[PDB]
Design a protein around this motif. Structure first.
Motif, short mmCIF file in Angstrom:
data_model
loop_
_atom_site.label_atom_id
_atom_site.label_comp_id
_atom_site.label_asym_id
_atom_site.label_seq_id
_atom_site.Cartn_x
_atom_site.Cartn_y
_atom_site.Cartn_z
N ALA A 106 52.90 -65.82 -13.74
CA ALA A 106 54.26 -65.13 -13.30
C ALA A 106 53.21 -63.88 -12.01
CB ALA A 106 55.77 -64.86 -14.11
N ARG A 107 51.95 -63.81 -11.82
CA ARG A 107 50.87 -63.08 -10.93
C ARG A 107 51.43 -63.75 -9.33
NH1 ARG A 107 48.29 -59.05 -13.58
NH2 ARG A 107 47.67 -59.21 -16.20
N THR A 108 52.18 -63.08 -9.03
CA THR A 108 52.05 -63.16 -7.42
C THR A 108 51.61 -62.50 -6.47
OG1 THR A 108 53.57 -63.88 -5.35
CG2 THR A 108 54.18 -61.48 -6.77
N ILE A 109 50.18 -62.66 -6.09
CA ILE A 109 49.16 -62.10 -5.18
C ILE A 109 49.33 -62.09 -3.83
CG2 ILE A 109 46.97 -61.61 -4.77
CD1 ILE A 109 47.63 -63.55 -7.79
N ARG A 110 49.65 -60.45 -3.05
CA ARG A 110 49.48 -61.56 -1.62
C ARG A 110 48.33 -61.54 -0.73
NH1 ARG A 110 52.81 -56.67 2.02
NH2 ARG A 110 50.68 -55.67 0.68
N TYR A 111 47.97 -62.45 0.19
CA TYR A 111 46.30 -62.69 0.82
C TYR A 111 45.67 -63.23 -0.08
CZ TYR A 111 48.95 -59.36 4.36
OH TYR A 111 49.18 -58.83 4.60
N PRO A 112 45.91 -64.51 -0.45
CA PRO A 112 44.74 -64.86 -1.50
C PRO A 112 43.69 -65.37 -0.01
CG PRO A 112 46.20 -66.18 -1.35
CD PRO A 112 46.73 -65.52 -0.39
N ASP A 113 42.52 -66.08 -0.76
CA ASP A 113 41.83 -66.79 0.02
C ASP A 113 42.26 -68.10 -0.11
OD1 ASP A 113 39.10 -68.13 0.90
OD2 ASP A 113 38.22 -65.94 0.33
N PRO A 114 41.70 -68.24 1.81
CA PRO A 114 42.13 -69.11 2.79
C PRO A 114 41.87 -70.71 1.54
CG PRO A 114 41.67 -68.31 4.64
CD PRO A 114 40.93 -67.18 3.37
N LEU A 115 40.78 -70.77 1.24
CA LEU A 115 40.01 -71.97 0.78
C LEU A 115 40.31 -72.58 -0.87
CD1 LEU A 115 37.57 -72.17 2.25
CD2 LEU A 115 36.31 -72.22 0.43
N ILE A 116 41.16 -70.73 -1.37
CA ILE A 116 42.19 -71.60 -3.04
C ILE A 116 43.18 -72.34 -2.34
CG2 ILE A 116 43.53 -70.52 -4.50
CD1 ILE A 116 41.76 -67.98 -4.11
N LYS A 117 43.43 -74.09 -3.04
CA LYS A 117 45.00 -74.52 -3.44
C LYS A 117 45.49 -74.17 -4.84
CE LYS A 117 43.68 -74.79 1.12
NZ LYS A 117 45.06 -73.77 2.04
N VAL A 118 46.62 -75.22 -4.49
CA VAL A 118 47.01 -75.35 -5.66
C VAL A 118 45.81 -76.02 -6.74
CG1 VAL A 118 49.31 -76.97 -7.31
CG2 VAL A 118 49.55 -75.41 -4.60
N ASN A 119 46.56 -75.75 -8.06
CA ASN A 119 45.58 -76.69 -8.77
C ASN A 119 44.52 -76.03 -9.17
OD1 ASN A 119 47.72 -78.55 -10.57
ND2 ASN A 119 47.83 -78.67 -8.46
N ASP A 120 43.88 -74.84 -8.91
CA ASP A 120 42.05 -73.59 -8.51
C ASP A 120 42.28 -72.97 -10.09
OD1 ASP A 120 42.51 -75.61 -6.14
OD2 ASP A 120 41.69 -74.36 -5.20
N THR A 121 41.92 -72.28 -10.30
CA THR A 121 41.66 -71.38 -11.27
C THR A 121 41.12 -69.77 -10.13
OG1 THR A 121 41.65 -72.46 -13.09
CG2 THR A 121 40.08 -70.13 -12.87
N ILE A 122 41.83 -68.71 -10.84
CA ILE A 122 41.83 -67.72 -9.72
C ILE A 122 40.60 -67.08 -11.20
CG2 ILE A 122 42.53 -67.15 -7.79
CD1 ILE A 122 44.10 -65.69 -9.27
N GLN A 123 39.79 -66.06 -10.86
CA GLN A 123 39.29 -64.38 -11.50
C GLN A 123 39.57 -63.84 -11.12
OE1 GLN A 123 34.99 -64.77 -13.73
NE2 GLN A 123 34.97 -62.76 -12.66
N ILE A 124 40.76 -62.78 -11.24
CA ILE A 124 40.80 -61.34 -11.08
C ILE A 124 40.60 -60.77 -11.93
CG2 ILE A 124 43.03 -62.51 -10.33
CD1 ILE A 124 44.04 -61.71 -12.68
N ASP A 125 40.44 -58.98 -11.93
CA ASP A 125 40.19 -58.35 -12.28
C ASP A 125 41.16 -57.81 -13.00
OD1 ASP A 125 37.10 -55.94 -13.01
OD2 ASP A 125 39.45 -54.72 -12.37
N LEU A 126 41.37 -57.26 -14.19
CA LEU A 126 42.94 -56.53 -14.80
C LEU A 126 43.30 -55.35 -14.28
CD1 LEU A 126 42.76 -58.05 -18.80
CD2 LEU A 126 44.07 -59.09 -16.64
N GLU A 127 42.22 -54.52 -14.43
CA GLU A 127 42.38 -53.05 -13.52
C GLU A 127 43.45 -53.04 -12.23
OE1 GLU A 127 39.52 -49.94 -12.06
OE2 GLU A 127 39.90 -48.89 -13.90
N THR A 128 42.91 -54.03 -11.21
CA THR A 128 43.58 -53.82 -9.85
C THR A 128 44.48 -54.75 -9.92
OG1 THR A 128 41.67 -55.29 -8.81
CG2 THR A 128 41.52 -52.86 -9.49
N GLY A 129 44.23 -56.49 -10.61
CA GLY A 129 44.66 -57.71 -10.52
C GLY A 129 43.82 -58.46 -9.17
#
Lengths: 262, 101, 70, 180, 124
Positions: free
Chosen positions: A143-166
């Motif tokens: 349930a994490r929503t992020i504004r402005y992701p990378d344009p190459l990211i599509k559905v069913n991919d995987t993002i590695q996120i930093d927990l301090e900033t999200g």
RNA sequence: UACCUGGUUGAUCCUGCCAGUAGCAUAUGCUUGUCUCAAAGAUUAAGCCAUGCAUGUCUAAGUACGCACGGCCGGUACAGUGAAACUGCGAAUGGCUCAUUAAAUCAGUUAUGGUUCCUUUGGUCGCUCGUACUUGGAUAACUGUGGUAAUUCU
RNA sequence: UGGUGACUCUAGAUAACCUCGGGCCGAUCGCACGCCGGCGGCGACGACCCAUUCGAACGUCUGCCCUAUCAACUUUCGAUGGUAGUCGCCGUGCCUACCAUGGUGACCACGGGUGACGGGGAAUCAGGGUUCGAUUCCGGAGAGGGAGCCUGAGAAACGGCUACCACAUCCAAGGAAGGCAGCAGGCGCGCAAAUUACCCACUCCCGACCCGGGGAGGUAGUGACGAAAAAUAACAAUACAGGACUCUUUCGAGGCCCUGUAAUUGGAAUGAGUCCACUUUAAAUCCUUUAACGAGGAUCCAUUGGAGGGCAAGUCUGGUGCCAGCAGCCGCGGUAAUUCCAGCUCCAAUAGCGUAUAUU
């Protein structure tokens, strides 16, 4: 029923909690959160049943209300907060860090991680939508929503996120030949490499996965979590490396372990 | 002439032989509605209280096979006994129902 | 005459040993005779046997273990 | 809704034909040379043997390379070899089908106390078991139907808290010594 | 003497500020050991004052050679008074509860909800 | 343990049922030393109910001029504990029972691209070009006078 | 711009609209206090909208017992469909207005019944089946019978309200109050079912909440529903009786053994109980652990059904004499009763065993 339900019977609880029959009539009933009720581990079960840091629920309440447990970098004081897949649990007083990833039998495993490995997590992206003023938004499996992701990211991919900033630090695409963990169904807990995806329009896609030992197993597309770029995982794997041993080989391992030590 | 008979019981034994003679005469003459009450359950220690209640029911069950014993110790037990006596199905004696008395 | 539905039946009490324990207008507990609704092997028209009289059994009265209240 | 469980089994089966002369003689003989209390113990041991035979003949119909046949057959064979009713060299399912009820009655704790010379008879062995005079390597055992494993056979010692064992005299000897 | 004590599953719970362990007490021919003597032996074992050791749940095996229970040794008496159940503190004499049944409290509560205002405090 | 036995005839062979036999559930009769578990006003009356109890709730963090208590220091608006009451939430969960209900419920399988949502979690929260160094009126709690045989009335 | 398998999707641009029974754009509260009157770091409480969680609600396909002495059913008062709208959170005859005459049925419609809540499941079980599932898990329904609402996110809520019907409570006669198919408990009904007990210590739930509450739930009480373990004696000597072994053709002889049977003796061992303590527990009880006492008719006495056959076990003795009775069935009893009532003996199961009924 006339409204929402607030109780969970102990035998109706998910089997991967491994609650017994005679302790009580009720199960902890995970509160609403980023993870589904059938696919989460509440804090009370992890602290009491798994780590044995407590014996009763009031003791878990004392541990939680001293503000010691941190989930995904934020302090949780709910005894029944749903912790789920890839979630990082930090206990600063004992100096321990855990990542809730599945055991090969289909259960959440107590997996200890290095403190510098606790600064990030992986999230499988559930949907992408362009919201108002043409702003791309990304919704992941917790349930994490992020504004402005990378344009190459599509559905069913995987993002590695930093927990301090999200914020997204990196991403892995859903391609053939990438490492994945199965997060549902019969093959739950198995780690392999993607070899197929059988598109059925109007129905569920099919991902065939090949294990490190040469064993193949298919799953639905919603049951796949991409964890690695090609062959190496971006996280630390549990004691088992995702290979499911047959009951005969598990018996042989048990007998060999008894023979070498004892 | 009575409508209800309250049989008082010993906690230790069931009844004397005098009580057995009275019971034989009352059974032969005709029993109206009856209720059994025990008097001395409070003097004993509690472990002995439960065990002697078991033994007393065992002893009495050869004459009153399905009857609940009550207790007569305090005023509230007396109130429950009086309420039990008020609401209870009435055994009807066929002789005195036809003639006036 | 049965209490629960008012139907009148004929029940079998075994002997004059036991018959003298039943007086008129006593409340008797009655069972079937054994052949699931069929008649006794000698006497016709009876399918039932008396089990208890005055809320005490016929076997404990025949054997002298109990007495019945009147 | 309670925190109670209701799983329970009957551990025997009463015979179909009640009065059989040959069957009555067989069960009475088994009670005789095994010191059993009644017929229900014979029926219990016969029931466990029948369960093992049913499992073996269900496994035997499968193909000989079936994984479940291999796993459950090895488990059943190891469980039978562990308690000493099958030999270590006779690990096959046909030998399971060839077992008899005397093999299971031999493995009782009462029979083993009789065999190892701790008692003078099988009934003395039962009475000795029930009176807390026997232990199995640390633990006093009251149950004559305690099935002895192969690693418990050399460990049936003789209850160091008893007059027959460690040495504190019993009630009757203590009272008789006070007469003089 | 002939009664001995061992601790099996040691664990240092820093979240509730204690040490928790499983206690095996050997007494071959005695009765079940009172919890006071177990507490003094644990105090001698772990070099602590004996009023911070709380032991419970002792079950003696059939035959009577061994008893198994649970115990915890707190850092101080303050952490003990903070993190212990009330009934164990009352077992050690550090806590006392009011002597009132549920019937009195419940009937009193239902009585003073027929009354609105400061007169609620006047119901005895 | 893939099992039968007795009964029609003067006798035999048979169709055929009755009777026997073993389990399981409810009741009951006689009997009952120890110990571990353990069902239990469903069947008949979804009949009727005396009495008592079963849903309430406060943190540093909405509102404290109840001395109801309370250390000050003595002009310090309110130290602090706190009944009551206003406010917020819960009371739609749980528990009981099986009367109704015959493609109805329900089970598996799918859809919401045809809808709603307290709460949790995440985002958004100077994106609007148009007295504020703080706005107004009450009402409880409290005080006082009461009405009714009676109420969780007012 | 981005997405889907497919949009009348998402995002964009224009022209406006924007409800007073009114839409967001913070007149809120705490803790440490500090840097250049100004800047502030942690939280709490709200907050339109979007996503998420817990679901809810309407749909898709397939799947239900008995009955034809139910063969045709639905259609003004919607039955099947079409067009526009109303209402609804939304799709939709949900409803309205106007049209078409449709829709279902021997592949059992429609009607009636059920001793019918459905399912996971339970009993029995060669294989196939047959019977059951009120009942602790999931879903549904209902709170005496119907009906209509308020509040709220969520109820057509009944430990909420308003009527009517049926009951029923108090009364100064004017009025007021009610709903145990919650936990105990009572009456009634019956063949048929427990205490008006203790506690929030466990399991969890709710709240402003680490602190309060919980007849949810836990703990005891009754409990031969049912399931598991398991006492009611064992040994030694002596005395008789058998079976083996040695010497004897044999009879016979064996301090030659083994095994039984006691109107024979003997001390050894233990529980059942009585009752300190510890343990258990929220406090207890029970169990377990231990002191003390505790067995020879070890009177510390095991019952329930049977003995003609089926079917295991008496043609014994006394009494009755087709009577009294027994007997599931065949049958026994009418003066020599293997069967009735008893004594003795024997048989089967055993802390259990008969009987009635349902069902396999």
């Amino acid at each position: 029923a006339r409204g929402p339900k607030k109780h969970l019977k102990r035998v109706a609880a998910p089997k991967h909690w491994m609650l017994d029959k005679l302790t009580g009539v009720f199960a902890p009933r995970p509160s609403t959160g980023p993870h589904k009720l059938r696919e989460c581990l509440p804090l009370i079960i992890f602290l009491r049943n798994r780590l044995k840091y407590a014996l009763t629920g009031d003791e878990v309440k004392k541990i939680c209300m001293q503000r010691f447990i941190k989930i995904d970098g934020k302090v949780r004081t709910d005894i029944t907060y749903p912790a789920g897949f890839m979630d990082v649990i930090s206990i600063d007083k004992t100096g321990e860090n855990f990542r809730l990833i599945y055991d090969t039998k289909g259960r959440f495993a107590v997996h200890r991680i290095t403190p510098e490995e606790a600064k990030y997590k992986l999230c499988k992206v559930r949907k992408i939508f362009v919201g108002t003023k043409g702003i791309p938004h990304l919704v992941t499996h917790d349930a994490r929503t992020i504004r402005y992701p990378d344009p190459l990211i599509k559905v069913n991919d995987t993002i590695q996120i930093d927990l301090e900033t999200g914020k997204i630090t990196d991403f892995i695409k859903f391609d053939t030949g990438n490492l994945c963990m199965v997060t549902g169904g019969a093959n739950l807990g198995r780690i392999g490499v993607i070899t197929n995806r059988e598109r059925h329009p109007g129905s569920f896609d099919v991902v065939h996965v090949k294990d490190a030992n040469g064993n193949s197993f298919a799953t639905r597309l919603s049951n796949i979590f991409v964890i690695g770029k090609g062959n190496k995982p971006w996280i630390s794997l549990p004691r088992g490396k995702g290979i499911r041993l047959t009951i005969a080989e598990e018996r042989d391992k048990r007998l060999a372990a008894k023979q070498s030590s004892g | 002439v009575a409508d209800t008979i309250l049989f008082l019981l010993d906690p230790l034994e069931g009844w004397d032989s005098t009580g057995d003679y009275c019971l034989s005469c009352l059974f032969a003459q005709g029993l109206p509605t009856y209720t059994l009450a025990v008097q001395g359950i409070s003097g004993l220690p509690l472990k002995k209280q439960i065990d002697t209640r078991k033994k007393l029911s065992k002893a009495v069950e050869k004459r009153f096979p399905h009857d609940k014993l009550l207790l007569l110790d305090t005023q509230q037990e007396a109130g429950m006994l009086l309420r039990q006596l008020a609401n209870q199905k009435q055994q009807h004696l066929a002789f005195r129902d036809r003639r006036a008395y | 005459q049965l209490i629960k539905n008012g139907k009148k039946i004929t029940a079998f009490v075994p002997n004059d040993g036991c018959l003298n324990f039943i007086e008129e207008n006593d409340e008797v507990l009655v069972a079937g005779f054994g052949r699931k609704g069929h008649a006794v092997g000698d006497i016709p028209g009876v399918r039932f046997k008396v089990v208890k009289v005055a809320n005490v059994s016929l076997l404990a009265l025949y054997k002298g273990k109990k007495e019945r209240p009147r | 809704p309670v925190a109670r469980s209701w799983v329970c089994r009957k551990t025997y089966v009463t015979p179909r034909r009640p009065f059989e002369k040959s069957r009555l003689d067989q069960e009475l003989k088994l009670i005789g040379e095994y010191g059993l209390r009644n017929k229900r113990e014979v029926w219990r041991v016969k029931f466990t043997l029948a369960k093992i035979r049913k499992a073996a003949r269900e496994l035997l119909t499968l193909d000989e390379k079936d994984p479940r046949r291999l796993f459950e057959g090895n488990a059943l064979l190891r469980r039978l070899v562990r308690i000493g009713v099958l030999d270590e060299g006779k690990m096959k399912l046909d030998y399971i089908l060839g077992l008899k009820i005397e093999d299971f009655l031999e493995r009782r704790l009462q029979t083993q106390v009789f065999k190892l010379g701790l008692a003078k008879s099988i009934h003395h062995a039962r009475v000795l078991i029930r009176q807390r005079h026997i232990r199995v390597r640390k633990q006093v055992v009251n149950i004559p139907s305690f099935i002895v494993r192969l690693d418990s056979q050399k460990h049936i010692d003789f209850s160091l808290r008893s007059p027959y064992g460690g040495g504190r005299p019993g009630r009757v000897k203590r009272k008789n010594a006070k007469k003089g | 003497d002939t009664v001995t004590i061992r601790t099996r599953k040691f664990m240092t719970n820093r979240l509730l500020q204690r040490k928790q362990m499983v206690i095996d007490v050997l007494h071959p021919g005695k009765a079940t050991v009172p919890k006071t003597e177990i507490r003094e032996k644990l105090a001698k074992m772990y070099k602590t004052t004996p009023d911070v050791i709380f032991v419970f749940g002792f079950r003696t095996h059939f035959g009577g050679g061994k008893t198994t229970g649970f115990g915890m040794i707190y850092d101080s008496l303050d952490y003990a008074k903070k993190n212990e159940p009330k009934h164990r503190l009352a077992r050690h004499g550090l806590y006392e509860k009011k002597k009132t049944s549920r019937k009195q409290r419940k009937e009193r509560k239902n009585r003073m909800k027929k009354v609105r205002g400061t007169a609620k405090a006047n119901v005895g």
